[PDB]
Structure 1
Amino acid sequence: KVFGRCELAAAMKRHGLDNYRGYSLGNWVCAAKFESNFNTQATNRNTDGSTDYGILQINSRWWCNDGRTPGSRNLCNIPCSALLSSDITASVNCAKKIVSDGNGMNAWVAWRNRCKGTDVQAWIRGCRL
């Protein structure tokens, strides 16, 4: 599913991401934009052989099982394919764990490089939330 911007913001808000570990909603929407272009089915292979899955491009090295990332963990206790569903529940719950791991949103390199320090509130401008 490709979410609309305000559609995704609402879903993220419902699932409790708005100010989760202090990160306003627009941080999460901005991250989603640059990680997946709001596409739940997005996948990307990393150089180390791990793969990123879903709207927030959650990596199989640590967070989900895909059966093909040697020596990896599955800390969200989910198959990586759950991260591609049109229902973002698994992506959001897993993101909660990731952002809690000590580096906050810096865990998402695109957030650090493209969102951090910008006017992220723009991402939710005009949305009925």
Structure 2
Amino acid sequence: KVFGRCELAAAMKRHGLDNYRGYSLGNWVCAAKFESNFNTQATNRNTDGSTDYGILQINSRWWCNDGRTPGSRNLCNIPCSALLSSDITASVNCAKKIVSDGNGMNAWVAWRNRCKGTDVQAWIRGCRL
């Protein structure tokens, strides 16, 4: 599923991400836009052989099991394929654990380099929330 901007904003809010660990909803939307372009089926392989899955490109190195990432963990206790669903519940639940890990949203590369510090409220401008 490719979400629209305000649609994902609403789904993220309904799933409790708005202001989770202090991060306003426009930071989550902005991170999704640059990680997956709002596509829940996005997958991208990393050089170390791990893969990132879903709207928030959660990495099999630590967070989900895909069966082909040696030495990794599955701290969200989920198959990485659950992260590609049209229903974002598993991605959101697993992102809450990631954002609580000690480094905040800096866990997402693209958020640190493309969202952090910018006018992220623009990502939810005009949306019915």
Q: Answer whether TM exceeds 0.5 for this pair.
A: yes
Indicate yes or no: 2:99 matched with 1:103: no
1:38 deviates by 0.1
Q: Once the 2 structures are TM-superposed, how far is the Cα of residue 40 of structure 1 from its aligned partner?
A: 0.2
Say which SS state the counterpart of residue 113 (structure 2) adopts.
helix
Distance, in Å, in 2 between the alignment partners of 1:102 and 1:33 is 23
- How far residue 82 of structure 1 moved from its aligned partner, in angstroms, is 0.1
TM-score w.r.t. length of structure 2: 1.00
User: Which TM-score applies when normalising by structure 1?
Assistant: 1.00
Q: After TM superposition, give the deviation of residue 85 of structure 1 in Å.
A: 0.3
The DSSP-based 3-state class of the residue aligned with 1:77 is coil
Structure 2 unmatched ranges of 5 or more: none
Alpha-carbon RMSD across the aligned residues, in angstroms, is 0.2
Q: 4+ runs of 1 displaced by more than 6 Å?
A: none
Seq. identity, %: 100
Q: Summarize deviations over 1:46-76 as a string: whole Å, max 9, x none.
A: 0000000000000000000000000000000
1:126 — aligned with what? 126
What is the CA distance between 1:122 and its match in structure 2? 0.2
Which segments of 5 or more consecutive residues in structure 1 lack a partner in the other structure?
none
Match of 2:30 in 1: 30
Aligned length: 129
Aligned equivalent of 1:12: 12
